[PDB]
Amino acid sequence: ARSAYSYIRDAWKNPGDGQLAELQWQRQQEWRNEGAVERIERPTRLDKARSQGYKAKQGVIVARVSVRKGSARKRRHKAGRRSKRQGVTRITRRKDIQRVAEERASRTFPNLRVLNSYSVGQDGRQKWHEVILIDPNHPAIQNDDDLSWICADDQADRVFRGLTGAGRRNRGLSGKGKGSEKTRPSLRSNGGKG
Amino acid sequence: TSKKKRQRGSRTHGGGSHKNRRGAGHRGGRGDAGRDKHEFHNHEPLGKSGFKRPQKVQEEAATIDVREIDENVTLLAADDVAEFRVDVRDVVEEADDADYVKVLGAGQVRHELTLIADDFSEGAREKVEGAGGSVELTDLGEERQ
Amino acid sequence: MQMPRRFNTYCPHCNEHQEHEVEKVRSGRQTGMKWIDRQRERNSGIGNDGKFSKVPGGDKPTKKTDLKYRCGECGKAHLREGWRAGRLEFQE
RNA sequence: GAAACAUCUCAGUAUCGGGAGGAACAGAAAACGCAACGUGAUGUCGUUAGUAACCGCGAGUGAACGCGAUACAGCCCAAAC
RNA sequence: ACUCGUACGGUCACUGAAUCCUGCCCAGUGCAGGUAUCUGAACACCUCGUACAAGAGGACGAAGGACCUGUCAACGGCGGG
RNA sequence: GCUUUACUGCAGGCUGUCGCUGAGGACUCUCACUCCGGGAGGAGGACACCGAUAGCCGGGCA
Ligand SMILES: C=C1C[C@](OC)([C@H](O)C(=O)N[C@@H]2OCO[C@H]3[C@@H]2O[C@H](C[C@H](O)CO)C(C)(C)[C@@H]3OC)O[C@H](C)[C@@H]1C
Ligand SMILES: [Cl-]
Ligand SMILES: [Cl-]
Ligand SMILES: [Cl-]
Ligand SMILES: [Cl-]
Ligand SMILES: [K+]
Ligand SMILES: [Mg+2]
Ligand SMILES: [Mg+2]
Ligand SMILES: [Mg+2]
Ligand SMILES: [Mg+2]
Ligand SMILES: [Mg+2]
Ligand SMILES: [Mg+2]
Ligand SMILES: [Mg+2]
Ligand SMILES: [Mg+2]
Ligand SMILES: [Mg+2]
Ligand code: NA
Ligand code: NA
Ligand code: NA
Ligand code: NA
Numbered sequence: 243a244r245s246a247y248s249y250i251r252d253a254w255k256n257p258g259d260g261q262l263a264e265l266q267w268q269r270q271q272e273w274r275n276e277g278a279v280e281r282i283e284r285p286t287r288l289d290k291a292r293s294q295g296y297k298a299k300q301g302v303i304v305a306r307v308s309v310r311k312g313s314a315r316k317r318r319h320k321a322g323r324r325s326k327r328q329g330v331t332r333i334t335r336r337k338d339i340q341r342v343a344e345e346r347a348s349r350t351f352p353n354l355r356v357l358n359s360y361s362v363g364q365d366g367r368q369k370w371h372e373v374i375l376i377d378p379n380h381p382a383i384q385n386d387d388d389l390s391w392i393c394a395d396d397q398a399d400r401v402f403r404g405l406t407g408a409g410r411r412n413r414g415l416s417g418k419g420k421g422s423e424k425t426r427p428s429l430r431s432n433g434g435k436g
Numbered sequence: 437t438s439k440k441k442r443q444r445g446s447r448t449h450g451g452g453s454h455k456n457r458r459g460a461g462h463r464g465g466r467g468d469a470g471r472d473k474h475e476f477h478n479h480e481p482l483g484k485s486g487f488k489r490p491q492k493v494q495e496e497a498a499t500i501d502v503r504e505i506d507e508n509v510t511l512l513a514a515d516d517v518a519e520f521r522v523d524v525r526d527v528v529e530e531a532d533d534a535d536y537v538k539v540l541g542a543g544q545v546r547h548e549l550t551l552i553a554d555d556f557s558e559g560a561r562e563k564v565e566g567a568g569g570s571v572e573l574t575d576l577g578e579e580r581q
Numbered sequence: 582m583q584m585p586r587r588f589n590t591y592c593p594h595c596n597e598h599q600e601h602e603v604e605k606v607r608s609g610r611q612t613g614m615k616w617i618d619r620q621r622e623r624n625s626g627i628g629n630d631g632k633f634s635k636v637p638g639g640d641k642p643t644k645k646t647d648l649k650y651r652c653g654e655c656g657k658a659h660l661r662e663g664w665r666a667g668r669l670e671f672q673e
Numbered sequence: 674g675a676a677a678c679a680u681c682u683c684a685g686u687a688u689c690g691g692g693a694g695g696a697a698c699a700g701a702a703a704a705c706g707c708a709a710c711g712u713g714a715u716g717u718c719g720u721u722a723g724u725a726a727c728c729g730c731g732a733g734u735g736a737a738c739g740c741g742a743u744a745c746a747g748c749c750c751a752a753a754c
Numbered sequence: 755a756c757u758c759g760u761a762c763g764g765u766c767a768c769u770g771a772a773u774c775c776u777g778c779c780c781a782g783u784g785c786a787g788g789u790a791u792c793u794g795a796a797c798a799c800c801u802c803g804u805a806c807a808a809g810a811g812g813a814c815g816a817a818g819g820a821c822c823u824g825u826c827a828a829c830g831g832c833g834g835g
Numbered sequence: 836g837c838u839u840u841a842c843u844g845c846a847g848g849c850u851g852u853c854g855c856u857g858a859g860g861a862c863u864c865u866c867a868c869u870c871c872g873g874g875a876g877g878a879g880g881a882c883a884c885c886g887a888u889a890g891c892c893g894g895g896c897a
């Protein structure tokens with residue numbers, strides 16, 4: 243039958259209706275007063291967490307990040323940068339907020355590696371994401387048959403090289419066919435036209 | 437002794453006034469510059485013309501002239517010698533991947549031929565029957581209606 | 582010059598002779614669903630556009646008479662050239 | 674560069690910020706669509722092709738499927754119980 | 755920043771000690787204020803349109819503008835007959 | 836380099852609108868949110884702030 247999990251999930255399908263609506267209105271007040279990276283004992287969205295790879299083990303950390311909202315905060319132009327080149331309040335950046343989050347998080351934890359992240363709400367001027375990080379040095383995880391992969395030296399700073407799932411989903415790598423000619427196998431490998 | 441070879445001493449290497457062979461000005465602009473002003477002479481006029489049908493909606497038929505067949509009847513010993521009978525499909529190169537094979541009539545037909553192809557031109561027939569011969573439309577070609 | 586509302590003339594159709602009216606093209610509006618309503622937003626953004634950032638041009642000291650020759654029995658029309666006329670009166 | 678110039682080009686180049694490895698990235702289809710009784714992860718090379726497509730439809734820009742090759746290797750969770 | 759500051763303040767301009775004075779002009783331009791009426795984008799909204807969408811018309815209507823007033827120690831003007 | 840009622844844009848100010856945003860064409864409220872207070876608590880209040888968009892002005896700038 244339905245798993246208790248499928249309930250948490252089925253609820254966040256519309257974080258603005260019912261109990262969850264009352265929760266967020268409350269939590270946020272507390273959230274809005276927390277740092278920019280708060281570690282938390284348990285994931286707010288359990289289904290999602292586990293689903294994304296979470297495990298109630300040793301070395302599996304969760305942290306809620308809070309990034310300022312908006313689009314782009316771009317200066318005008320020092321020298322003589324023409325019209326098509328005067329970006330300031332009408333353009334946005336090529337990296338989505340969740341990626342910014344994942345990064346700030348991994349920095350706060352200079353030894354942990356990003357596993358994944360999820361949204362947990364957003365008031366009128368900031369977005370919150372919980373990021374699942376992992377200690378590649380705790381044997382507790384070095385042994386785990388489902389997570390020991392995140393230990394390869396070539397997984398170091400995996401988030402800063404866009405290896406997160408959201409990382410890849412942003413580098414235009416979702417589709418295996420049409421419209422991904424300039425993305426895969428690498429944006430840089432494609433003279434950045436993706 | 438090449439031309440280049442004799443240039444040492446010319447100073448201008450054919451150019452003319454040492455003031456000629458300078459920048460892109462001498463060429464009237466880089467590339468197709470002024471292709472419609474000073475160097476407009478002999479430049480397909482400006483504009484858009486007609487349309488194109490999507491590439492995967494295009495039929496490319498493999499064609500051959502009765503003449504080609506006829507000229508090699510005897511040399512095609514590896515084929516039928518009916519009361520000659522030949523399935524063109526096995527004669528045209530580039531056949532394997534052609535939307536279909538069509539026999540175009542052009543030239544004499546000094547033979548009685550039993551040709552078999554996806555489609556023939558109204559003329560290829562005349563030239564075939566008129567040579568005491570028949571022509572057969574492949575099962576495929578049976579979509580002529 | 583004026584213009585007889587209904588004169589006897591030929592037409593690139595019935596290979597005969599009937600009566601052709603005189604009506605100055607009332608034209609039509611901007612579809613909104615054309616190849617220019619889309620590339621007007623695609624050839625823009627921030628800065629200039631060239632042909633889209635351009636404006637309408639002047640006119641000659643006169644306007645040729647653009648018409649449409651409708652038919653009697655038929656009901657359809659064709660298109661001929663126009664004449665530089667300050668005005669025009671389709672008499673009756 | 675467009676023989677000026679704003680879109681366009683130069684060019685996602687120069688330069689800057691962050692990060693990994695001896696290689697990186699990619700990768701086992703919500704694919705393809707020579708529409709098929711067809712192919713079967715991924716890079717890469719030859720070609721497809723200066724083709725399709727874009728574009729003050731100007732100057733210019735410019736793929737892919739397929740094919741021939743190189744090398745080949747497929748798997749693990751979340752949930753149900 | 756001004757600012758450990760608060761209109762006897764400090765900001766932004768002009769003229770350039772004292773002394774005698776500092777005329778007329780608000781049409782244009784600027785600034786400010788008002789405004790029946792008119793004009794005035796997008797969203798939501800009504801009608802039609804599309805099994806949806808593109809779309810057509812309507813409706814309401816902000817700042818702004820029209821319009822009206824104030825202002826020249828505000829830009830400036832002080833002629834011809 | 837500089838100027839402007841040159842062309843084209845951008846900051847920026849003004850304004851409508853959408854989100855933040857809640858309870859009962861004019862109104863009440865308090866609970867988000869903002870400010871004052873050491874605090875208790877006070878003021879303000881779905882406005883303001885911020886994200887987005889739309890119209891006007893826009894040599895301050897390119
Ligand atoms: C006769 C002339 C006309 C035109 O052709 C040469 C050209 O047609 C034009 O410039 N304006 C036209 O306006 C009426 O019909 C169209 C045309 O295009 C407009 C867009 C414009 O091309 C770019 O901004 C438009 C808005 C699509 C408009 O829609 C009604 O160029 C010169 C002006 C030349 C003098
Ligand atoms: Cl990481
Ligand atoms: Cl074609
Ligand atoms: Cl007319
Ligand atoms: Cl195939
Ligand atoms: K330039
Ligand atoms: Mg034009
Ligand atoms: Mg030039
Ligand atoms: Mg590569
Ligand atoms: Mg030109
Ligand atoms: Mg390019
Ligand atoms: Mg393809
Ligand atoms: Mg002085
Ligand atoms: Mg304070
Ligand atoms: Mg300037
Ligand atoms: Na780290
Ligand atoms: Na792209
Ligand atoms: Na020379
Ligand atoms: Na083939």
Ligand code: NA
Pocket residue numbers: 623
């Ligand atoms: Na587009």
Ligand code: NA
Pocket residue numbers: 676
């Ligand atoms: Na030039």
Ligand code: NA
Pocket residue numbers: none
């Ligand atoms: Na110049």
Ligand code: NA
Pocket residue numbers: 680681728
């Ligand atoms: Na262009």
Ligand code: NA
Pocket residue numbers: 780781
């Ligand atoms: Na005045």
Ligand code: NA
Pocket residue numbers: none
């Ligand atoms: Na004077």
Ligand code: NA
Pocket residue numbers: 836
């Ligand atoms: Na200078």
Ligand SMILES: [Sr+2]
Pocket residue numbers: 398399
């Ligand atoms: Sr590191």
Ligand SMILES: [Sr+2]
Pocket residue numbers: 449450451
């Ligand atoms: Sr020469």
Ligand SMILES: [Sr+2]
Pocket residue numbers: none
């Ligand atoms: Sr030179």
Ligand SMILES: [Sr+2]
Pocket residue numbers: 472473476
């Ligand atoms: Sr010309």
Ligand SMILES: [Sr+2]
Pocket residue numbers: 530
């Ligand atoms: Sr072949």
Ligand SMILES: [Sr+2]
Pocket residue numbers: 623624
């Ligand atoms: Sr475009």
Ligand SMILES: [Sr+2]
Pocket residue numbers: 625626627628629
């Ligand atoms: Sr524009």
Ligand SMILES: [Sr+2]
Pocket residue numbers: 641642
């Ligand atoms: Sr004239």
Ligand SMILES: [Sr+2]
Pocket residue numbers: 745
């Ligand atoms: Sr294989």
